[PDB]
Amino acid sequence: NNYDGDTVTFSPTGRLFQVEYALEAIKQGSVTVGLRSNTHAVLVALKRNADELSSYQKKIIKCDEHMGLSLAGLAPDARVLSNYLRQQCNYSSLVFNRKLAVERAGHLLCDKAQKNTQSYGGRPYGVGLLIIGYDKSGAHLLEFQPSGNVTELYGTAIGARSQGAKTYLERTLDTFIKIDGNPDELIKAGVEAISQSLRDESLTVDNLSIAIVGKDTPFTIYDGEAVAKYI
Amino acid sequence: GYDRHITIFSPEGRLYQVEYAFKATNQTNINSLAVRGKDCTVVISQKKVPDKLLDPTTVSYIFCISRTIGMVVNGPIPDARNAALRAKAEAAEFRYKYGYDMPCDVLAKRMANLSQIYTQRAYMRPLGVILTFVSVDEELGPSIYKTDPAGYYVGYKATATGPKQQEITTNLENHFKKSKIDHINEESWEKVVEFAITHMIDALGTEFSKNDLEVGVATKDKFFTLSAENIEERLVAIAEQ
Amino acid sequence: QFNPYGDNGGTILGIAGEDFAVLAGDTRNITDYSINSRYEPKVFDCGDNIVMSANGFAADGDALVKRFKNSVKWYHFDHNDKKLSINSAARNIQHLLYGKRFFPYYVHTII
Amino acid sequence: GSRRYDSRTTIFSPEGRLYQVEYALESISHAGTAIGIMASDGIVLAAERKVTSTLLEQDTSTEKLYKLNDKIAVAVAGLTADAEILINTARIHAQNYLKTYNEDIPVEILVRRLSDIKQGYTQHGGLRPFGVSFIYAGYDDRYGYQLYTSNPSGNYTGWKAISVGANTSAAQTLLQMDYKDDMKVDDAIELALKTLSKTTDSSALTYDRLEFATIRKGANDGEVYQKIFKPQEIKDILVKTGIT
Amino acid sequence: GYDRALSIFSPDGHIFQVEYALEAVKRGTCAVGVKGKNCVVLGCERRSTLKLQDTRITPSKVSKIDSHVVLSFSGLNADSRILIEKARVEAQSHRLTLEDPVTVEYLTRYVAGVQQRYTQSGGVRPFGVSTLIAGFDPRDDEPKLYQTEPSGIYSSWSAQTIGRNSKTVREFLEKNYDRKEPPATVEECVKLTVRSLLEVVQTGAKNIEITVVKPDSDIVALSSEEINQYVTQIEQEKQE
Amino acid sequence: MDIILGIRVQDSVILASSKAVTRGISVLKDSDDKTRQLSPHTLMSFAGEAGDTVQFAEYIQANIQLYSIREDYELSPQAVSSFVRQELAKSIRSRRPYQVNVLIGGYDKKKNKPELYQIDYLGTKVELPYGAHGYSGFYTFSLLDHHYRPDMTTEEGLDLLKLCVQELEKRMPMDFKGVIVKIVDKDGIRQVDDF
Amino acid sequence: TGYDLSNSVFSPDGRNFQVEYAVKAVENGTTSIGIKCNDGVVFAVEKLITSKLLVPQKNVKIQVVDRHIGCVYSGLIPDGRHLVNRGREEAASFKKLYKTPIPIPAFADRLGQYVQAHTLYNSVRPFGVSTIFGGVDKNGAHLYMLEPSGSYWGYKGAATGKGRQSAKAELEKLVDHHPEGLSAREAVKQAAKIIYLAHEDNKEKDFELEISWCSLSETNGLHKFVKGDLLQEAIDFAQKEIN
Amino acid sequence: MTDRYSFSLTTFSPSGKLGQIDYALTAVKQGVTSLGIKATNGVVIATEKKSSSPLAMSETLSKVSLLTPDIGAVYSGMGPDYRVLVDKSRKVAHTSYKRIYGEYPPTKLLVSEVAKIMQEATQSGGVRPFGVSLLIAGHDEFNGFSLYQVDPSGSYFPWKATAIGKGSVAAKTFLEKRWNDELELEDAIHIALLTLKESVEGEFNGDTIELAIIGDENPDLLGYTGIPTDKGPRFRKLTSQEINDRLEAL
Amino acid sequence: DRGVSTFSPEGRLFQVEYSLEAIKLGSTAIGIATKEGVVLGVEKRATSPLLESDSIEKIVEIDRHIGCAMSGLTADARSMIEHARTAAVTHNLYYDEDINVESLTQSVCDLALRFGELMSRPFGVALLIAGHDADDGYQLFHAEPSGTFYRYNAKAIGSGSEGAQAELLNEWHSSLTLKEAELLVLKILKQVMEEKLDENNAQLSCITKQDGFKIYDNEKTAELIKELKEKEAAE
Ligand SMILES: [Cl-]
Ligand SMILES: [Mg+2]
Ligand SMILES: [Mg+2]
C-alpha cells in the first residue's frame, strides 16, 4: 500500500510487497512440472503462444551437460539467471575440473536473487525456476523463487494452475521415485502430472516441451515431433 | 513534512532528527556518572540484566578504547559498539601517525566532528548515543569529555547521563558547592569509586548489589573495569561507615 | 630475471585428404635435455568434428586449447546448438591468439 | 530511498518552463538595481547597494561591481556568494585564453563560457541553478565596447543600455526614452544615475548606497582603463549631475 | 552522480518531459525554412519586446555549423548553444577522419541523435529546442532542408516552420508552396519566406532576419535595408 | 621528413618544403606536400618523425578550423603560433611526444604584416625574418644572413630562395627531390607551380 | 507520520520503525534455538514440512562458519544466508592476517557491525533475521544471538522465531535446574525436546528436526551435524517427553 | 550504501526564497549574542560563554578561535558547525595560501575562502547549509585592521562594528551611537563590554565572557627569538583576570 | 514518486506496460513470412504535405540477410539498429559467417530491460525483424521493449494492429508466394490506414536468399498497388 514503492521497504507486518508482486508474475506464467527418480530427473513444460501465427515461447534452458532448468514468469530474467548458472557451472569445470553440484547451484541462485531484494534502485527477479541435474550424489530437483528461497524436492510444479499437478505428484510420490532405469516411464508420469493443470487446451506437438538428465544421459531437450511419442 | 525525516532545517531552525536521536539515548533506561579524583577518573554505570538466559559478563556499556582512554555509552548497544569500534580505530591511527597516545579531549573532539557530519549530511543518520570519555591525560590530568548526537562536546569536572541525570547532576553540583574544588580530594581510586557509588545511591534513592553496577577506572598509563568482586569489596566499605 | 616462456619440444603434423583429415603428434614432453613424460597427449578432440594441437610452450598450448573448447561450448549456447564449421573455428582462434598480440601464446597451432 | 526527497531542479513544467530558473529570476527581481549604459567612447556601470547601514565599511566593500580582467567588468544582481563562484571561474577562463593564444579574451567568448556553465545547472546534475544575473561591460579590438547580460537560464543577449535586478520594467522604459546612439560617457553617467534615482525604493539616492564604474578609452592613447569609483568620487559625481 | 530518471513513460504511453520540451519550442520565436530550386532560405523572427538591444553582438538566430551548412532553431536559447557546439565539433571531426565535409542529412542525424539520447539518459532533461538544418552536400547542387525536435525524430521538408504561431505560417506555406515548381530564383525564395513571416511577425522592421545559403559554401545574411525592400514590395502588391 | 625553409619579405611569407618521402632504402614518393592550410591567411609546414607529422598538422588544422566557425573570425598568426607552441610544449612531457618541427607562415590582416614563426618539437617558438629546421639552416643561413633585406619583394625572396635550394642540392648528401614553394600574403595562400 | 516509510529515520519516540518491522518477519519465521553446555554449544531448528514432496534431510538450514562456528537463524532465509556469507569472509580475513581462527566474541561483533550498518542508511533494508550462533575458541564456549537492529548479547540459552516464548520458558528451567552446568550430549537431547515443545505454535504442519553442535570433548571443538543414531536417540527422547 | 543524495536539498521556492538559508538564519537568531568593534589601532571580538551546565568546564569550550596568528573568529548559532568551519578555515589558510606564497593570507581572502565553503553547503548535493554567522577580525600589512561578517548563504560584508545573534538588533543600535573613526583599542574594548552587558542575563565576569583582540604584535607569544622580521601574533585572547580589571572601570 | 523498475500488483513492470501504449499510437507495420521470402511493409504517415515522405525511414537494413521494420517512438530505434548492425558485423568478424536471425533478435532484446536508476527508461518502439539463414530458413520475429521476442508466420504492429492481425489470421497459409504476400501487406495496410494508400505514404520491402534485403522503389510499389486494385475489382 504505502510500503510497496520499492524493494527496500518492509511493511508494518514484516512483508516485502515488491518481492510478493514478483512472486505474482510467476503465477501468471504458464505451468511447468519437475520430477525425479534415483536415476533420472525430468522437466515437463507447457509452452505458451501469443496467437495462432506465433511460435510457442521456449520454457527449458540447458546450463551444462549435467544440469538445466525450466522457467515460469519473465523470460528475460530466466535468461539472466540461466546465463549466471552457465558461468558458475563453467568456472567449476575450468578451475577445479569439477562438475558443479546441483545443491551448490541452488545456493548461488539464492544469493544472487537476495542482493536484488535488499538494495535500493534494483528490483527482484520476476521468474520462478525448476532446476534438474545429475551429479556425484545422483539425481536432483530444485525449485527457485525470486524471494531467494531455493528448495530441493522429489517433484513439484510452478506457474498457473500448478496446484493440480503438485497434488498429483504428492499422491504418486511412492510410485515415480521408484522408476529407475526407465526414462520413458518417468516422462510419462511427468506428462500425466502436467495434464492435471490443463483446462480447455490439451497437449499438442508444438505445445509440449520435455527435458531429461540421468546417469548415462546428458541434459537433452525434446520439442516438436520428438514429444509426439508422449502425447 | 520531510524536514523531520532527514537532517535539514525546520522553519524554526531546528534539526528534529538530532532531537529524536537524543530521545533514543534514554531507550536503555540506564544512568551513568563520572567524577575525577586527584590521580584518577572514575566512571560508574547501572547494570541491568533483565533476562536470566543472558550471559551477564557480556552485558556492558563501558569500553576500553585505548590503554589510557575509557568510554561509557548512554544509548542502544548497536550504535554504542559502532562508536566504540570507530574510537578504537581513531585512537590507534593517531598514535601511528603522530607518535604519541591520543588525548581524551582530542578523541572526544574527533568523534564530535564525526557526529556533526551526520547532522549536516543527509544520507548518514545520527547515532542515538551519548559518549562519555575518561582518562588521566599526561598534560591535562584527570579528564571527562562528553559527546552527543548534535556534535556538541565539552570538558567536565564531573557529569551524569541518563533518564535521571538531573537528580544526579544536582546532587553532584551541591557537593562541589561545599568543597569548592574541581575534583574529589582523595588519594586512592578505591575511595573515589566509593564516593561515586555513594552519591548515585543518594541521588537515585536506590540500593545496589554487586551485579547492579558497572565500574570503570582511569589511572596514569592505564584504564580498567572492575569485576563483580572488586565492586563487592567497594560496596562492603560503603556499608561499614 | 623471470622468463615467462619455456620450450616443451614436440612435433605435430596435419594432412588434409579428399574426404578426411589427420592431425598427428608425438607424445614426448621435455625441458632442455630431460624427458618430462613419454606419453603426454598433445592432439585433442574439441567437439564438432574438429581436432586441435597447440605445439611449443605447453602451458600456453594447454591454455589455448582449453579456451577454444570453451568457445565451442558457448557457441552452442548462444547460437542454438549450431555446429561450428572448421572455417569459423579458424577465425575464432585468430581472435584468441591476436587477443594476446603483445604477450603471445608461444605456440604453433594446427586444427 | 533518497528519491523521496529529490526536488528535481532540472525539469520542465507542463507549460515548458524551467521551474527553478523562473523562481531564481523571481529572487533576482528583489536584488538591488544594476544598470549598464554603452556609449561611443566608453561604458558605464551603475548599481545600488541594498538597504545598507551607517556602520558598513563602504570603502573596502564590494557587492555589485567586480573586475574579471583589465578590459572586462561585471555588475551583479542576486546572491553575492553565487556570483563570486562564477566570477572566479570567469577570471580563470580569461587567464587560460591569454596563456593559450597570448591575446586578451574577446568579451563574447568569456560571456558565452559563463552562460554555458549556468545552462549546465538547468539541464543536468540535479543541483539548484545560480541565482545570479550579470551585466558584462567590456572592450576588445574586434567589436569595441560591448554590453551583455546573462541570467540563471544561461541565456545571454547584447545591449546598448540595460538594467537587471529590481524595477527593471520601470528602469528599461526610462533608458529607452532618453538613450541615443551618438551619446557620450559623461552623458551616460548622468542617465544611469538619473534612472536609479527615479526607480529606487529608497527615499533618496546617496553616495553610500551606490557602486559605480566606467570603462573608458579615456586612457593615455590607444588603450582602455577601468575605473571603480571610490566613495568620495561617487559623492562628487552625484553633486556634478545635480542629484544631491 | 545524479542518476534520476526524469524522462519516463506515463500510463497513457506519453513521455511528458519530451512533450513539455515541445511546449518550450512553442513559446520560442518563429523560425521558417524554404528551399528553392538552387538555394535554401532560413527566416527567423526577432521579438520587438527587446529594444535598446545591440544587434552587432547579440547572438544571431542562424548559426553556421560548417562553411556549407547552417542551423536555426526555436525554443530555449541556452540549450541551442550546446547542440550547435556539438554539431560544429562533429563537423570538424568528420572532415578529419572521412576527409570530406558532412552531408546535411548526416549532420541532422547527429544532432537528432544527441537530442534523443537526452530523452532516455539518467539525470538529464530533454533539449527544449527544435532545429531547422539547411545547406548543400559537398559537390552537390541539390538543396537540403531538415527539421529536428526534442524527441529526436528528424525528417526532410520542402518547406517548414517551427516556434510560436508556426501553425499559421505552415498554413500559409501549404497553400503557397508548389512542389512541381519551387521558387526558381533567390529573389522568389526570399520573397516567399518574408511573406510567410509577415503573416505572424507584426512589423517588418528589425523583426525579420533572413539568411540565404547557396551551393559551394556560399552563405550570406541579408541586411535590414535589403529585407525592408522585400517588405515594401510585398505590401504594395497587397494593396489591390 | 627532411628540408623545410621559410622567409618573410615585405608583404608576404614564403615557405619551401621538400617533396621526397624516403623509407630507409627507397624513395617512395617525389611529390609530397609537407604543409597544411590552418586558415585562409595562415600556412603551416612541418617535418619530423613519420606519421606524427601529418597526425599533428591535421589535428592543429581541425582545431583552428573549429575556432574559425565558432567565432566567425580568423585567428591572428601570432595567436595560432601560440596555440601550436602550447600543444607541442604539452606534448614533450607526454607518454609518447609528437616528434614534429613546424614553420608557421601567416599574413596578419589586422596589422597588414607578414609573420614567420619557427617552432620545434620541444615547443621552442621564435619569430624570424627567415627560418629553417634540421640541417637546412646550416647550409642556407649564411646566404640569408648576407642577401636578406626586410624590404624585399616576393620575386626577390623567391630568387634568394632559389640560391638556397641550389646550395642545398650541391652540398647535401640526400636527394630531397626539389621543393614545393607556397606564398602567403593579403590575398591568401597560393602555390608556385614552377620551381 | 511517515517515520516508518524510510530506514534509518528516527521517529519522535527515538525509534527506527523499519527495524521493528524487520522483527515482525523474524517473529513470523520457524523456531530456532541455542544451548550453551559445559564445553561447547548446541544449535537446533524447526523445519516445516510444507509438503510430502520435500526430500528429507536435504534442505539444510544450519550453516557452518570457518570450522568451529555454527550459525542458525529464523525469518527470511536468504537474508540469513547473506549474513553467513559475510561472516565467512570476515572469519577468512581474520585468519589470513592473525593466523589463529576468529574468536567467537570477535566474530559476534563482525556480524553485529555489519547488521548495524544496515540501519544507518535509507538505501538499504534491515536484515529480516535473528541469528543464533556460537562455538568453541581458546577461552572456551560462547553462545550469541543477533537481532535486526545489530543488537547482540552472550547467552546461556537462546531462542527466536514463532515459538520463542515457549522455548524461552523451557530454557529458563534448564538454567535454574542445572547451575553446575549441562553436558554436550544432554544439551542435544534437551534441544530436541525444546523444538518439539515449541512446535505447538506451528502445529498445523508436521516438521523435521535438525541439530548441530560444537564441543571440546565430543567434536574436538569443531562444528558437526548431529546425524544417524545420535539424532534418532534425541528424537526418541523428545517424543517421549511430549507424551 | 553510497551517498545517493546527489541532488540539492536547498532550492528556490515560488517566491524566490531559499528556504534552508532562511531557516539557517533563524537558527543563528536563536544563538547567543556575539559582536565585533574595529578601532584605529586594533579590532575586538566578544561573546557570552553560555555554559550548558555548571559542572561543565567552560574554559575547554572556545567560542573565540585563532585562525591565523593575525586573524581571529567568533560566531552565533550552532557551535558544532562553527567548530568544523574553524578546522576547515585553518587548513585552507595553509593549503590554498601559505604553502603557495610562504605567508599567511590577508583577512579578506581567508574570509572569501570560508564564505566559499559555506556557499557550497548551500548548493552541493545531500547537505544542509551551515547554521552559523561568523565574525572574522584580522590584520595584514597592506589592508590594515578589518572586521568581516559571514552568513549561512556565503555572503560576507565588512563592518566598522556589528553584532549577530540573540540581541543583535538592540546591540547594533547601541554600537551606532558609540562608534567613531577615532577610537583606540581600549575604547573599543570598553564599548564591547558595555554592549555585551545588555544581552547577558545572569553572571557578567571574565569567566562568563570570552573576548579577544587583533592588536599589536606580541613578541612574548612568538615562542622564539633571532629573526627580526618575525615579531609575533597580533591575535590575543584576553584572560579572565584582564577582563575583570576593565569591568571595574566600567 | 516511484521506482522505474517497479512491479505492479498484477506482476507486471509499469514502465514496460506503459511503453506498450506508446507503440499502439505508432504507425502500422506489417510482416509476412513465406517460403519464397519475408515481406515487410509500413505506413509512413507524414504529418504534413510539405514533409518529403521519402525521408521517412521506418524500414531499415541490419545486414544483407536481415531487414527490420519499426513502429512507435521511432527515434528510440536508432540505437537498437546501431547495436543490431554492430552485432551482425561483429559476429561475421569473429566467425567468418552470417549470424542467425534469432541470435541477432536475441542480442537486440538483451538491451530492452537494461533500464533503471544503463538508460533511464524502456524503448518506446516495437520492431519486426525479418531475415534468412541456412539453418532455419526465412524467419520473422517481433521484438518488444519487454525483452520478449516471438517468431511469427505473419505479424502486424502499430495503431491498426489488432484489426490487421485478425485479417492476417484468415489470409495466411503455408503455400503463399512472394507476390501474393506483397499484395496482402498492401491490402491490409490500405484497410487500416487513415489516408488513402499510395506509393508515397506506404513502403514495401523484402528479404530473399538470392538478392538479400531490398527496399522497394516507389515505382515498383506503385505497380503492385495498381495490380491490387484490379484484382479486388475482379470479384
Ligand atoms: Cl576531525
Ligand atoms: Mg543525516
Ligand atoms: Mg626552434
Amino acid identity of residue I115, one-letter, is F
| Cβ pair A131, A11 in contact under 8 A | no
Domain that holds residue F77: 1-195
From B131's Cα to the closest Cα of chain D, the distance in A is 29
Residue G220 CB coordination number (10 Å): 12
The domain that holds E75 is classified in CATH as: 3.60.20.10
Q: Is C100 on the interface with I (CB under 8 A)?
A: no
Helix (H) / strand (E) containing F155 = helix F154-171
The reply to whether residue I103 touches residue C79, judged by beta carbons under 8 angstroms, is: yes
CA distance linking residue B86 with residue B65, whole number of Å: 9
CA distance linking residue G145 with residue G111, whole number of Å: 10
Give the DSSP per-residue string, B53-96.
TB-GGG---EEE-SSS-EEEEES-HHHHHHHHHHHHHHHHHHHH
Chain D CB contacts of G5 under 8 Å are: 4
CA distance linking residue H191 with residue H162, whole number of Å: 12
CA distance linking residue F49 with residue F67, whole number of Å: 27
Instruction: Tell me, in angstroms, the distance from the centre of ligand 1 to residue B113's CA.
Output: 5
* Cell numbers representing residue H77 in the block: 548559532
* Cell numbers representing residue F20 in the block: 621526397
CATH superfamily of G1-243: Aminohydrolase, N-terminal nucleophile (Ntn) domain (3.60.20.10)
Instruction: Tell me, in angstroms, the distance from the centre of ligand 3 to residue F123's CA.
Output: 8
Residue I119 DSSP symbol? B
Instruction: Tell me, in angstroms, the distance from the centre of ligand 3 to residue F83's CA.
Output: 15
Chain D CB contacts of H115 under 8 Å are: 81, 84
| CB burial readout I28-59, b (16+ within 10 A) else e | bbbbbbbebbbbbbbbbbbeeebbbbebbbbb
From H24's Cα to the closest Cα of chain B, the distance in A is 6
Strand partners, A49: A56
Nearest residue in C to A91, CA atom: C70
H224 contacts: CB under 8 Å, gap ≥ 6:
H230
Instruction: Tell me, in angstroms, the distance from the centre of ligand 1 to residue H89's CA.
Output: 13
Backbone φ and ψ for C56, nearest 5 degrees, come out as 140, -105
Give the DSSP per-residue string, I38-65.
EEEEEE---SSTTB-GGG---EEEEETT
| Cβ pair D95, D87 in contact under 8 A | no
CA distance linking residue H103 with residue H140, whole number of Å: 11
H44 contacts: CB under 8 Å, gap ≥ 6:
H36, H37, H137, H185, H188, H189, H192, H211, H212, H213, H214
The CA-based dihedral angle spanning residues B8, B12, B16, B22, taken in that order and rounded to the nearest 10 degrees: 130
From E57's Cα to the closest Cα of chain H, the distance in A is 31
CA distance linking residue E138 with residue E103, whole number of Å: 7
The domain that holds D80 is classified in CATH as: 3.60.20.10
CA distance linking residue A132 with residue A35, whole number of Å: 8
Q: Is H7 on the interface with G (CB under 8 A)?
A: no
Spans of all domains in chain G: 1-243
Residue D132 CB coordination number (10 Å): 28
Residue H113 CB coordination number (10 Å): 17
- Domain A1-231 grouped into CATH 3.60.20.10: yes
The reply to whether residue D14 touches residue E20, judged by beta carbons under 8 angstroms, is: yes
Residue E53 DSSP symbol? B
Instruction: Return the ∠ at Cα F186 (arms to F181 and F187), rounded to 5°.
Output: 75
CA distance linking residue F65 with residue F82, whole number of Å: 16
Into how many domains does chain B fold? 1
Instruction: Tell me, in angstroms, the distance from the centre of ligand 3 to residue D102's CA.
Output: 18
| Cβ pair G47, G195 in contact under 8 A | no
Nearest to E159 by CA among E193, E185, E200, E207: E193
G94 contacts: CB under 8 Å, gap ≥ 6:
G101, G102, G106, G107, G110
Residue H96 DSSP symbol? I
Residue E212 CB coordination number (10 Å): 20
Provide the residue count of chain A.
231
CA distance linking residue E136 with residue E212, whole number of Å: 12
> Taking the domain H1-250, which CATH number applies?
3.60.20.10
Backbone gaps in chain F, preceding residues (C–N over 2.5 A): none
Q: Write down which chains contact chain A via at least 3 CB pairs under 8 A.
A: C, D, G, I
List of E strands, I14-111: 29-33, 38-43, 59-63, 66-72
Nearest to A128 by CA among A103, A102, A84, A160: A160
Q: Edge-to-edge, what's the strand order for the sheet holding I59-63?
A: I59-63, I66-72, I125-133, I137-143, I149-151
Provide the residue count of chain F.
195
* Cell numbers representing residue F34 in the block: 609537407
CA distance linking residue D76 with residue D31, whole number of Å: 9
CA distance linking residue B21 with residue B4, whole number of Å: 12
- The bridge status of strand B153-156 relative to strand H56-57 is antiparallel
G25 contacts: CB under 8 Å, gap ≥ 6:
A10, A14, A15, G75, G76, G128, G129
Q: Is D99 on the interface with I (CB under 8 A)?
A: no
The reply to whether residue F62 touches residue E96, judged by beta carbons under 8 angstroms, is: yes
Chain G CB contacts of D2 under 8 Å are: 122-123
- The bridge status of strand A60-64 relative to strand A67-73 is antiparallel
CA distance linking residue C101 with residue C109, whole number of Å: 15
Question: How big is the D-E interface in CB pairs under 8 Å?
Answer: 106
3-state secondary structure string, F65-102?
HHHHHHHCCCCCHHHHHHHHHHHHHHHCCCCCCCCEEE
The domain that holds F154 is classified in CATH as: 3.60.20.10
Nearest residue in F to D105, CA atom: F79
Residue H153 DSSP symbol? T
CA distance linking residue F179 with residue F191, whole number of Å: 11
The full set of domains in chain I, from first to last, is 1-235 (3.60.20.10)
Phi-psi map region of E135: left, alpha, beta (phi>0 left; psi -120 to 50 alpha): left
The domain that holds B33 is classified in CATH as: 3.60.20.10
Give me the resolution in angstroms, 1 decimal.
2.9
Give the DSSP per-residue string, C51-98.
EEEEEESHHHHHHHHHHHHHHHHHHHHHTTT----HHHHHHHHHHHHH
CA distance linking residue F104 with residue A86, whole number of Å: 62
Ion ligand 2 — residues with CB < 5 Å: B 7, 122
* Cell numbers representing residue I53 in the block: 515522405
The reply to whether residue F69 touches residue E92, judged by beta carbons under 8 angstroms, is: yes
Active site residues of G: 30
* Cell numbers representing residue F123 in the block: 615547443
The E-side interface with I (CB below 8 A) comprises 3-15, 112-113, 116, 119-122, 146, 151-153, 155-160, 170, 173-174, 177
| Cβ pair A108, A84 in contact under 8 A | yes
Q: Is C92 on the interface with I (CB under 8 A)?
A: yes
Strand partners, I162: none
Into how many domains does chain F fold? 1
Amino acid identity of residue F67, one-letter, is Y
Nearest to G70 by CA among G191, G163, G181: G191
Which residue's entry shows cell 498445523? G204
The interaxial angle of helices D80-101 and F77-91, nearest 10 deg, is: 90
Chain I CB contacts of A6 under 8 Å are: 2-3, 6
Chain H CB contacts of G123 under 8 Å are: 1-2, 4
Spans of all domains in chain A: 1-231
Chain D CB contacts of G123 under 8 Å are: 1-2
Into how many domains does chain E fold? 1
CA distance linking residue E133 with residue E62, whole number of Å: 10
Into how many domains does chain D fold? 1
Domain that holds residue E228: 1-240
Task: Count CA within 13 A, CB hemisphere, residue I205.
Answer: 29
What's the distance, CA D48 to chain centroid? 11
End-to-end CA distance of chain E: 65
Query: Which ligand places an atom closest to the C-alpha of H83?
Result: 1
Q: Is F109 on the interface with D (CB under 8 A)?
A: no
Instruction: Tell me, in angstroms, the distance from the centre of ligand 1 to residue D224's CA.
Output: 50
